[PDB]
Amino acid sequence: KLPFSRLVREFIVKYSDDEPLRVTEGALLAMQESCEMYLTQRLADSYMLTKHRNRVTLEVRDMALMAYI
Amino acid sequence: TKPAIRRLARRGGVKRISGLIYEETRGVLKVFLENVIRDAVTYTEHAKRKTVTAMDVVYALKRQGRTL
């Protein structure tokens, strides 16, 4: 929860206007589920490049080709 | 944390990970989340309501393309 609440709090406050925007547990849990799978997806796709590169170590090299696309 | 990144890599089938991934992974996500939270916050505040709901998160995800 520690790095998730920080980002949520920073960005609700950053992107508020007259006030921070309440929120529910389902909203917070729904967001947290979504964001986890996004990192799983992009790391895994970049890992597909890793295997294609005849290496076993996911590296910032592999993260960059999916990110460039 | 370091094991949360490890946990995400092992979910994706990644066995071992280099040390820069830790910082790189946080950056990539914030971009995603900035859009999710921004969009959610923007829709939630604009749409006759001031509370983020599960469907507002859903609305933010549709508005991504880093999903498609």
Author numbering:
A (entry chain A): 50 to 118
B (entry chain B): 31 to 98
Which lines from the publication concern this structure?
Centromeres are microtubule attachment sites on chromosomes defined by the enrichment of histone variant CENP‐A‐containing nucleosomes. To preserve centromere identity, CENP‐A must be escorted to centromeres by a CENP‐A‐specific chaperone for deposition. Instead, fly‐specific CAL1 appears to combine the roles of both HJURP and the Mis18 complex: pre‐nucleosomal CENP‐A recognition and its targeting to the centromere for deposition, respectively (Phansalkar et al, 2012). In this study, we present the structural basis for the recognition of CENP‐A/H4 and CENP‐C by CAL1.
Extensive crystallisation trials with CAL11–160–CENP‐A101–225–H4 and CAL11–160–CENP‐A144–225–H4 yielded two different crystal forms: form I that diffracted X‐rays to about 3.5 Å and form II that diffracted anisotropically to about 4.4 Å. The difference electron density map calculated using the molecular replacement solution revealed unambiguous density for most main chain atoms of CAL11–160. CAL11–160 is almost entirely made of α helices that make multiple contacts with CENP‐A/H4 heterodimer by wrapping around it. Most CENP‐A contacts are made by CAL1 helices α1 and α2 and loop L1, which interact with the CENP‐A helices α2, α1 and loop L1, respectively, involving a total interface area of about 940 Å2. CAL1 L1 crosses over CENP‐A L1 to facilitate CAL1 α2 interaction with CENP‐A α3. In addition, CAL1 α4 contacts both CENP‐A α2 and α3 involving an interface area of about 80 Å2. These CAL1–CENP‐A interactions appear to be further stabilised by CAL1 α5 and α6 which together with CAL1 α1 make an intramolecular helical bundle resembling a latch that restrains the position of α1 helix. Strikingly, unlike other histone chaperones, CAL1 shields CENP‐A α3 through downstream α helical elements. When compared to the available “histone variant”—chaperone complex crystal structures, the overall mode of CENP‐A/H4 recognition by CAL1 appears to be novel as it is the only one which wraps around CENP‐A/H4 through multiple CENP‐A and H4 contacts resulting in the shielding of CENP‐A/H4 surfaces involved in CENP‐A/H4 tetramerisation, DNA binding and H2A/H2B binding—all critical for nucleosome assembly.
